[PDB]
Amino acid sequence: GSEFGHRTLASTPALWASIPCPRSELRLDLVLPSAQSFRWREQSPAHWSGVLADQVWTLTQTEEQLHCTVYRSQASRPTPDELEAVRKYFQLDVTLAQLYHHWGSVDSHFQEVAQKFQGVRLLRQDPIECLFSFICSSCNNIARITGMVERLCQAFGPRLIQLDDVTYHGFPSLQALAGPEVEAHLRKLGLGYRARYVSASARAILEEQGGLAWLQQLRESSYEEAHKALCILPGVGTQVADCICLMALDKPQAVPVDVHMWHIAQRDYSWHPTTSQAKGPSPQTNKELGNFFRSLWGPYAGWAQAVLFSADL
DNA sequence: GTAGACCTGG
DNA sequence: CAGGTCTAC
Ligand SMILES: [Ca+2]
Numbered sequence: 001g002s003e004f005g006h007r008t009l010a011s012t013p014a015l016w017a018s019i020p021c022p023r024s025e026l027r028l029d030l031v032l033p034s035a036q037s038f039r040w041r042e043q044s045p046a047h048w049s050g051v052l053a054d055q056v057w058t059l060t061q062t063e064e065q066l067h068c069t070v071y072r073s074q075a076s077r078p079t080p081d082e083l084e085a086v087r088k089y090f091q092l093d094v095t096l097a098q099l100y101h102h103w104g105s106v107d108s109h110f111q112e113v114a115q116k117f118q119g120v121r122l123l124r125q126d127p128i129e130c131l132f133s134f135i136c137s138s139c140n141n142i143a144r145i146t147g148m149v150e151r152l153c154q155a156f157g158p159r160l161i162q163l164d165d166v167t168y169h170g171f172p173s174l175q176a177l178a179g180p181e182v183e184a185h186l187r188k189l190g191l192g193y194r195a196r197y198v199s200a201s202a203r204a205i206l207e208e209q210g211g212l213a214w215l216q217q218l219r220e221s222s223y224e225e226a227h228k229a230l231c232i233l234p235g236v237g238t239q240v241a242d243c244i245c246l247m248a249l250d251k252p253q254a255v256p257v258d259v260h261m262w263h264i265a266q267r268d269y270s271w272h273p274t275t276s277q278a279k280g281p282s283p284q285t286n287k288e289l290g291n292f293f294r295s296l297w298g299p300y301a302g303w304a305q306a307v308l309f310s311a312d313l
Numbered sequence: 314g315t316a317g318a319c320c321t322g323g
Numbered sequence: 324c325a326g327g328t329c330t331a332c
Contacts, residue, residue, distance in 0.1 A: 235327090
C-alpha cells in the first residue's frame, strides 16, 4: 500500500536514513529548484525526488537531519556507501558557515543579504548532464528549461523506475545524443535551435575531442584550461562554460555572468566597466565583471554568486 | 568588436 | 517579449 508512490518520512520510516546536516549548511528548497540541476521535483511537500548516482531518491530535511531514501529489488534503507554519494553530490565537506563568514567579512552587502538566505551551496553535477542541460538554458527561463530537459531524458535516457505516474529516466549518454536524427527529434520536443547544439556537441565530443574522457578529465585541469576547452563545443559560450566549470568541474571560482548578475552588480555595487568602453554586456565587459567578483569574494566566487541569486527572488 | 538571426511559450 | 551563442561587417 504505502509501498507504492513516492515516500515521505512518516509513511515509510524504516526506509529512510539520515545524514547529519543542519539547515544552515543546506536548504533543499533553495538549492534543488534554483537552476543548478533541473531534475528535482518536490513531489510531496518538503520532499524532493530525482535521479542521483544513477538511482532515484527522495530527500527531505528536519532541523539537523538530511533524510534520504533510495528506490533501486527488495525495499530497504540507504546503505552507508549510497548515503556517501548523497554527501558528495551536496559537497557537504565544504562548510557553508565558514564560506558565509569569509564572504560576509569582505563584503558588507553580502553580509546583510546572506543572513536571510543560508544553506545555499553548489551541487557537484555530472559533466554531461550539466553540459547539455545548460546548452538548453540559452534565451530561456527555468520552467521551459525544466520541460525541455525532461522531454529530452524521456526520449533518450534509460528508464529507471516508476513511482506513481512518473517514470524516471537517467540522463542521455553521449552515444544517444550523438545518434542519427536526434536533432529533428529534439525539435519535435520543442528545444528549438538548441536541438542543433545538443546534436552537434554530442558528436564533436565523441568524434573530435576523444569522447567522455576528454570531458571528465577537465576536472583535473585548470579553470582557465577547462573553460578554454569547453568553449570549443557548439552552443557552449563563455557563460554556459562557466556554469559547467562551477557546477560539474570543481571550479568554485567560476562566475557565470548573465544579465541577472549585471543587474546585481549595478544595483548593489554601483559597478561599471573599467576596461571596455562598452557600457553594457559584451564579451569584454562580461569577462571583467567576472573578474570583479573573483577579486571581491575569492576562490569561491561562484558559490557566493549562488547565494546572491537566491536572495534575489 | 558590435548588431540581428536562432526557436517558441507568454 | 526572454538568461546566450554564433557570425557577419
Ligand atoms: Ca563555442
